[PDB]
Design an enzyme around this catalytic site. Structure first.
Site, PDB file in Angstrom:
ATOM      1  N   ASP C  53      56.311-120.142  24.062  1.00  0.00           N
ATOM      2  CA  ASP C  53      57.744-120.034  23.673  1.00  0.00           C
ATOM      3  C   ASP C  53      58.359-118.643  23.654  1.00  0.00           C
ATOM      4  OD1 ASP C  53      56.350-118.989  21.137  1.00  0.00           O
ATOM      5  OD2 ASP C  53      55.757-121.097  21.076  1.00  0.00           O
ATOM      6  N   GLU C 132      46.121 -89.153  30.699  1.00  0.00           N
ATOM      7  CA  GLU C 132      45.364 -88.577  29.609  1.00  0.00           C
ATOM      8  C   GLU C 132      46.188 -88.503  28.345  1.00  0.00           C
ATOM      9  OE1 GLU C 132      43.002 -85.576  32.363  1.00  0.00           O
ATOM     10  OE2 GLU C 132      44.857 -84.723  31.569  1.00  0.00           O
ATOM     11  N   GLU C 134      46.513 -88.080  24.384  1.00  0.00           N
ATOM     12  CA  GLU C 134      45.995 -87.436  23.191  1.00  0.00           C
ATOM     13  C   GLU C 134      46.419 -88.297  22.005  1.00  0.00           C
ATOM     14  OE1 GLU C 134      46.498 -82.719  24.232  1.00  0.00           O
ATOM     15  OE2 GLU C 134      48.345 -83.864  23.974  1.00  0.00           O
ATOM     16  N   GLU C 218      35.282 -85.774  26.668  1.00  0.00           N
ATOM     17  CA  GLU C 218      35.622 -86.223  25.334  1.00  0.00           C
ATOM     18  C   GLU C 218      35.883 -84.910  24.588  1.00  0.00           C
ATOM     19  OE1 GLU C 218      32.505 -88.066  22.679  1.00  0.00           O
ATOM     20  OE2 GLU C 218      33.282 -86.400  21.479  1.00  0.00           O
ATOM     21  N   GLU C 226      41.071 -86.580  22.583  1.00  0.00           N
ATOM     22  CA  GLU C 226      41.414 -87.120  23.887  1.00  0.00           C
ATOM     23  C   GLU C 226      40.136 -87.421  24.638  1.00  0.00           C
ATOM     24  OE1 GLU C 226      44.218 -85.033  26.848  1.00  0.00           O
ATOM     25  OE2 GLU C 226      42.369 -85.341  27.995  1.00  0.00           O
ATOM     26  N   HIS C 275      49.515 -86.719  30.107  1.00  0.00           N
ATOM     27  CA  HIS C 275      49.598 -86.083  31.414  1.00  0.00           C
ATOM     28  C   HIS C 275      49.239 -87.117  32.463  1.00  0.00           C
ATOM     29  CE1 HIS C 275      48.563 -82.047  29.243  1.00  0.00           C
ATOM     30  NE2 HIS C 275      49.794 -82.454  29.001  1.00  0.00           N
ATOM     31  N   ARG C 346      51.825 -74.240  32.358  1.00  0.00           N
ATOM     32  CA  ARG C 346      51.584 -75.508  31.692  1.00  0.00           C
ATOM     33  C   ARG C 346      52.859 -76.034  31.029  1.00  0.00           C
ATOM     34  NH1 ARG C 346      47.329 -74.643  33.549  1.00  0.00           N
ATOM     35  NH2 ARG C 346      45.244 -75.551  33.275  1.00  0.00           N
ATOM     36  N   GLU C 365      50.453 -83.551  38.821  1.00  0.00           N
ATOM     37  CA  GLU C 365      50.364 -83.942  37.426  1.00  0.00           C
ATOM     38  C   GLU C 365      51.696 -83.811  36.703  1.00  0.00           C
ATOM     39  OE1 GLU C 365      47.308 -82.548  34.019  1.00  0.00           O
ATOM     40  OE2 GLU C 365      48.824 -81.062  34.524  1.00  0.00           O
ATOM     41  N   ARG C 367      53.362 -83.628  33.548  1.00  0.00           N
ATOM     42  CA  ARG C 367      52.957 -83.284  32.187  1.00  0.00           C
ATOM     43  C   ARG C 367      53.868 -83.729  31.053  1.00  0.00           C
ATOM     44  NH1 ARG C 367      48.965 -79.865  31.922  1.00  0.00           N
ATOM     45  NH2 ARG C 367      49.617 -78.895  29.953  1.00  0.00           N
TER      46      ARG C 367
HETATM   47  N1  LIG Z   1      44.473 -89.836  43.892  1.00  0.00           N
HETATM   48  C1  LIG Z   1      43.789 -89.369  42.995  1.00  0.00           C
HETATM   49  N2  LIG Z   1      42.595 -88.797  43.301  1.00  0.00           N
HETATM   50  C2  LIG Z   1      41.836 -88.280  42.297  1.00  0.00           C
HETATM   51  N3  LIG Z   1      42.111 -88.255  40.918  1.00  0.00           N
HETATM   52  C3  LIG Z   1      43.381 -88.864  40.610  1.00  0.00           C
HETATM   53  C4  LIG Z   1      44.267 -89.448  41.630  1.00  0.00           C
HETATM   54  N4  LIG Z   1      45.452 -89.983  41.108  1.00  0.00           N
HETATM   55  C5  LIG Z   1      45.291 -89.741  39.780  1.00  0.00           C
HETATM   56  N5  LIG Z   1      44.038 -89.051  39.311  1.00  0.00           N
HETATM   57  C6  LIG Z   1      43.618 -88.646  37.649  1.00  0.00           C
HETATM   58  O1  LIG Z   1      43.709 -87.170  37.271  1.00  0.00           O
HETATM   59  C7  LIG Z   1      43.231 -87.194  35.806  1.00  0.00           C
HETATM   60  C8  LIG Z   1      42.639 -86.030  35.087  1.00  0.00           C
HETATM   61  O2  LIG Z   1      43.017 -84.700  34.738  1.00  0.00           O
HETATM   62  P1  LIG Z   1      42.370 -83.368  33.944  1.00  0.00           P
HETATM   63  O3  LIG Z   1      43.006 -83.173  32.346  1.00  0.00           O
HETATM   64  O4  LIG Z   1      42.868 -82.167  34.876  1.00  0.00           O
HETATM   65  O5  LIG Z   1      40.740 -83.494  33.914  1.00  0.00           O
HETATM   66  C9  LIG Z   1      42.191 -88.161  35.737  1.00  0.00           C
HETATM   67  O6  LIG Z   1      42.503 -89.058  34.685  1.00  0.00           O
HETATM   68  C10 LIG Z   1      42.084 -88.564  37.273  1.00  0.00           C
HETATM   69  O7  LIG Z   1      41.139 -89.600  37.371  1.00  0.00           O
HETATM   70 MN   LIG Z   2      46.073 -82.159  31.764  1.00  0.00          MN
END
Ligand SMILES: Nc1ncnc2c1ncn2[C@@H]1O[C@H](COP(=O)(O)O)[C@@H](O)[C@H]1O
Ligand SMILES: [Mn+2]
Ligand SMILES: Nc1ncnc2c1ncn2[C@@H]1O[C@H](COP(=O)(O)O)[C@@H](O)[C@H]1O
Ligand SMILES: Nc1ncnc2c1ncn2[C@@H]1O[C@H](COP(=O)(O)O)[C@@H](O)[C@H]1O
Ligand SMILES: [Mn+2]
Ligand SMILES: [Mn+2]
Ligand SMILES: [Mn+2]
EC number: 6.3.1.2
Lengths: 477, 477, 477, 238
Positions: C53, C132, C134, C218, C226, C275, C346, C365, C367
């Site tokens: 529902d 990632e 946190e 970790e 994280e 990120h 960053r 990335e 961020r």
């Molecule tokens: N195409 C890709 N090839 C490799 N890693 C990737 C890709 N797309 C996204 N990622 C992610 O990049 C993230 C990590 O970032 P870091 O804090 O720099 O260790 C991980 O969670 C990866 O697995």
């Molecule tokens: Mn990062």
């Protein structure tokens, strides 16, 4: 229906049962009991029955009709999962010792009479009822009524009104996850703080013979919960409801909680209702379906709905029999107070579940009921209202699928509402109850007793006592 | 009636008044105010009036009608005995700034219109009202309404429910004399624990212009009390009632207590009512007497009674305007719920006081009212009901002097009762209020506003909130 | 992607699963559920689906669209490590009962539509997302909002603000090691007081199918932590995020703690972000690499970045969807508020991780995101922004590797910032959302619903409530 | 007089065991506290605001003054409602003076003309939007400057509205401009348009820039960086 006295004796022997709990239903809806040793449970109990006294005082056989005879219903035999001493619970029918005549004020006899009447009309031979009763799980409840004051208080560690608690009741820290967020009311743990308890309840229901299949779920929202199961024929469905409440209440009790099936325990939170799905069958075949009809409904089904909607003002006296029932049945949370049928609207008294082309799944759902009363009387009253609609070919007003909430004020005035007070529905039952007395299912005697009980024990007591809000409103007048 | 603006200025000068309190009545019945320096209180206040804003929100002039003009009533001028800074209190009438037209929703204007209408009918030129309002004196009051609970608690050191207190609230010893004995409910001290307080109240009333003569007493029973005074013409009688409540409430307040005029603050103890004695006069002579009539009543008086009894179902919407009103108006303490007149029965809506052959003392007493509302509207509504009875020569059913309590059940069914719920009387007012609109005394506008106010602000709020007794009754369902 | 319905049935049989938890995502981002017995989990669940529902009220199917059909995603099947009764959790897609058409407001359908759209553009066939998130581990949290006051309080035994505690919450002695020292924020035990808890979280993630390899760590700093894991295709990456939060929150819960993923729970301490690493692939080969381009980025990758930076003002409505999101996205801890890409900075919205010459490791990335919302919508919105950049060959402004903090004030004014308020990004989304509706991935309907939800349920509620600091600032005005 | 009033109110309470606050919105769910400012211009001992022929008995001078107030309101509020708390009162609800129109009926109108009759000496305009959370010297001055700029440039205020603004057809209600809903907004507007203030050297760009900096650094930013309690109710569980 299918269980034999021998099946019960085998169950008792295999389970090494030491006690047998003799249960019967009182007028308002609470199961009563007394216990006998298993050694005294033999064939003579099924043949001759058990003798007992009209005990306690209102509804049943006073001291001009005193003694009663109890005959067992083998289909209701279940092993109690809570009692330390291995016990077998069985429900009984109350008979007159002398004539062996079913007592007219025994709720279980009314349900049986309702099923027999259905068969006698030739309309159908089976009325299936599927009921879904919501309940609340609390940690505590206290209240009183005195000359100079009165109060009530229900509480739960994880209640959303406790986000500001410095520490828990037991001195432990407040860990949060109490807030009730917008977006979805069935969040996963840790927002859901009753996962293990509900699972215990479900496990106990399954071990007690409840059938969970297709669309049978276990669901929880805050402290509220519901576990639906497979339907059953009228009488046994009512027995199942009593069993369900028993299992839910005691599973909670054994786990440090306290459950309530009352309609509206919380002001500003969802009420608890009992949606009742109904359908008539004959010779193993469904009578509710018809591809050509609106919502796939047959003429029989539509007339049944006509009976429910027409008789609702009085039907509610058995279906929503408490003063608290009308705190739920009030303008707000899309309360089933609108006397119309629909497939979309949940604020409609009757809703037709979208089940497709399968004729065996077609049924109507009376949404207005709650579990604050007697399921034997409620289900029976619903059947009688539906059968009267079929016999007199009562046509329900046109169904409404447009959202009832946003409707042009002049067009919305054409939608009848259910009464908003118990005193009202009781007055309506008193004025119109012939459909109930058809085939002798309900007697004027029982109906008058019910009316008196509610007026003297519920309506009047609440009415004479000042409400706390009256002090907020009028102390300063 | 007889006080001149010059009399008021003299009072102000002689008393060395430094502030003038501008008072006006709101819809439900509570006096509102704002203060101006005495130096700004001159002839222009009586001639031109004072300007003020529709403030706060319901009943009065919103932001499409905003500004109001206030004109003083010199007869209501009184020195405030509580305010530290010497203050003169005066009640005002609300007028439209532009047209100088009396605002139709100002309760004081309704009462004035009622008096003018009386004169216009030629029936009489003066309607005298004598009201006796009972009240309770407490030490404390607390209450609340939450999602998971609600409570209320009124208390008094000498309350009969406190006989078992180990020590008093303040740690002092329990000295007894709290018990409410059988035999007489007006015992002398020390059973009477409010002698000095009531005397202070009486002294303040006398110093505030109240006239106490013949059968005007100061009486007390437990925490309940009543001080009756001499009647007055309709409008001024209503002003006197507001003054009385003000003086009673603040005398208690200045002496460490808290008073309530609510109809039923205690469950299991007497409610508080407002018995209203009424009578019509013309050219300085009484119109209620006639040696030949029953109870010494004239045709005019009997027709007036016919109007009260006939219109009672709707009249009660102004006369017993609160939800709490119906906790008093319920079968029990000989509640004035019986729609008949009498000389003996105190459970009769209308009672004719035994006054003898003196025509000037003959009057009728409407016992049903309470002081939970607006006296201006209540008195006016009573007059209109009586006048409609006179104009249409409505004959009241035969009076009953036999004790109504012990009456043969079939003969007792011929005695009509007043409605038992506020929602009921409000429904009845909505359905039948033409007698109120006669001569334009009440407007459909005002009546609709009153109906909406009660439904939205009182009836609905109480109705949606679970009552504490519902938990006693249904937590276990 | 690769798991078969048969694989799921085998998992269920081997694990002796007794219940199956049916999960689906709500609008804001919280997973909802209901449970069915394992016996009812068969092939018909995958073929026909499960009926349910529109329950609760905002976002989903109201009472004009009520009933929904749920179809399972076999790749999301996982054994719940917290539930006492052996349970199998599976995520579902919401479909229309009749048409079997994917419901347009189901977040999981949006993510699936986004993946299908990617394929339809021919640009690529797979979008990989690595997120990632946190989070903070606390011991307690309490808060409330009343008429005369409001407060909040999060606490942790080892919180740096508790160095002066005479004794711990439980009466035990303060053993120190709470202080947050300069030099390094990842100290070993005993400064690190959550080693065993984080290990339990990591162990649970690994047992739940999370892949930890190369640069998957970790890490913990004070109460913040994280645990990153291997990326996945868009939809499944979003499912992984929901699973991650579920596992983190409940591992803490079972160990006497309470976790929060809110952006800024602590004033004067690091916020919590998400990120998001993204990259497009086609036919098993990477499309983001190019030795000749800046940072080893291809034309496709650079255009994707152009889309992210160009659409950021509106993208943030799904990527940083809460009022609290802007307490993190504020000038300070090198907050990703600068609308530029970089390899060093960053504080740049987009950062290109230094991965060398390996084309398979090249990715961008984003961020700026946080985990205060819906990952299905956030990831999808990010993809749509990137794809719009590729289709329209949007060129991002020149990258900046110079430390953005110390930049000549006139040269720093050329660096665009992200909006600083939720109301802002919501306004921007309303004004520009065509890139989202491309290929029908997002509908104007869903976007308008999101905008209304945020304005009515978040923006307005916070805005009307006085902030505690306003009392410090203005009580004395 | 306003400063004296606040001093006397605050200390009378203080000497009697209480504590007073003039902050705009101390209670959530209760009326805010405002400062309704009645204004009028006079010359040679005679009133300049009255005119029997004009709407609400207003002269051309008075109407232009109102035009200045309504036109400059977005920036005027930076001195008239100078605190973050000011916008908890100036929000949709208790008929908050946020509607940029003049009227005789509506209390939710920024400017209201008190019904005073035919007496020219009593005719005046009432700016309802202000509160006492700031500086009365600057607030009154800013109001005068806004009004004078309206008179000099003969700024015509949009048509007055006496129909209840609350119940107005949604399409016709969209033609009613609202005051900004945030301090950062009015501060931005003051920064962008403050020439009417600098006329005759009454306000200096220096003072205006100082005010803008003061509010941004000492009020706007400090509140903005601090998580609100309701954010925990709303987002702790995200
Ligand atoms: N195409 C890709 N090839 C490799 N890693 C990737 C890709 N797309 C996204 N990622 C992610 O990049 C993230 C990590 O970032 P870091 O804090 O720099 O260790 C991980 O969670 C990866 O697995
Ligand atoms: Mn990062
Ligand atoms: N004739 C019938 N055929 C099928 N189901 C029925 C019939 N009569 C009643 N039901 C009950 O309909 C109820 C469930 O409703 P729901 O909340 O829509 O899953 C169940 O408790 C069913 O077992
Ligand atoms: N016309 C009238 N003549 C004499 N007394 C009146 C008249 N109209 C009303 N009354 C009031 O009757 C009331 C008292 O009732 P009791 O409780 O019987 O002493 C007093 O408050 C009287 O002053
Ligand atoms: Mn249902
Ligand atoms: Mn009396
Ligand atoms: Mn004013």
């Amino acid at each position: 229906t299918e269980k034999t006295p021998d099946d019960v004796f085998k169950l008792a022997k295999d389970e090494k049962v030491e006690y047998v709990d003799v249960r019967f239903c009182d007028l308002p809806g609470i199961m009563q009991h007394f216990t006998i040793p298993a050694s005294a449970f033999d064939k003579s109990v099924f043949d001759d029955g058990l003798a007992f006294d009209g005990s306690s005082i209102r509804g049943f056989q006073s001291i001009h009709e005193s003694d009663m005879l109890l005959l067992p219903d083998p289909e209701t035999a279940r092993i109690d999962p809570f009692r330390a001493a291995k016990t077998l619970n069985i429900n009984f029918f109350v008979h007159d010792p002398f004539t062996l005549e079913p007592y007219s004020r025994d709720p279980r006899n009314i349900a049986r009479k309702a099923e027999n009447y259905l068969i006698s009309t030739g309309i159908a031979d089976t009325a299936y009822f599927g009921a879904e009763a919501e309940f609340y799980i609390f940690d505590s409840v206290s209240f009183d009524s005195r000359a100079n004051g009165s109060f009530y208080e229900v509480d739960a560690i994880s209640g959303w009104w406790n986000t500001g608690a410095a520490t828990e009741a037991d001195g432990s820290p407040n860990r949060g996850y109490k807030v009730r967020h917008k977006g979805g009311y069935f969040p996963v743990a840790p927002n859901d703080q009753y996962v293990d308890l509900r699972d215990k309840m479900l496990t106990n229901l399954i071990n007690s013979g409840f059938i969970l299949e297709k669309g049978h779920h276990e669901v929880g929202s805050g402290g509220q919960a519901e576990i639906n199961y497979q339907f059953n024929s009228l009488l046994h469905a009512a027995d199942d409801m009593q069993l369900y409440k028993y299992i839910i209440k005691n599973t909670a009790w054994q786990n440090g909680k306290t459950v309530t099936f009352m309609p509206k325990p919380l002001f500003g939170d969802n009420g608890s209702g009992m949606h009742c799905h109904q359908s008539l069958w004959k010779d193993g075949a469904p009578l509710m379906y018809d591809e050509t009809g609106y919502a796939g409904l047959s003429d029989t089904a539509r007339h049944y709905i006509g009976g429910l909607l027409h008789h609702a003002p009085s039907l509610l006296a058995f279906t929503n029999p408490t003063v608290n029932s009308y705190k739920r049945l009030v303008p707000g949370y899309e309360a089933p107070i609108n006397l119309v049928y629909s497939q979309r609207n949940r604020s409609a008294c009757v809703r037709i579940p979208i089940t497709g082309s399968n004729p065996k799944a077609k049924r109507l759902e009376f949404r207005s009921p709650d579990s604050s009363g007697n399921p034997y009387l409620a289900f029976s009253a619903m059947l009688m209202a539906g059968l009267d609609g079929i016999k007199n070919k009562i046509e329900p007003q046109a169904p409404v699928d447009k959202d009832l909430y946003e409707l042009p004020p002049e067009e919305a005035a054409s939608i009848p509402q259910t009464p908003t007070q118990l005193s009202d529905v009781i007055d309506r039952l008193e004025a119109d109850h012939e459909y109930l007395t058809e085939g002798g299912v309900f007697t004027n005697d029982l109906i008058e007793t019910w009316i008196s009980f509610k007026r003297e024990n519920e309506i009047e007591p609440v009415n004479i006592r000042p409400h706390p809000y009256e002090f907020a409103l009028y102390y300063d007048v």
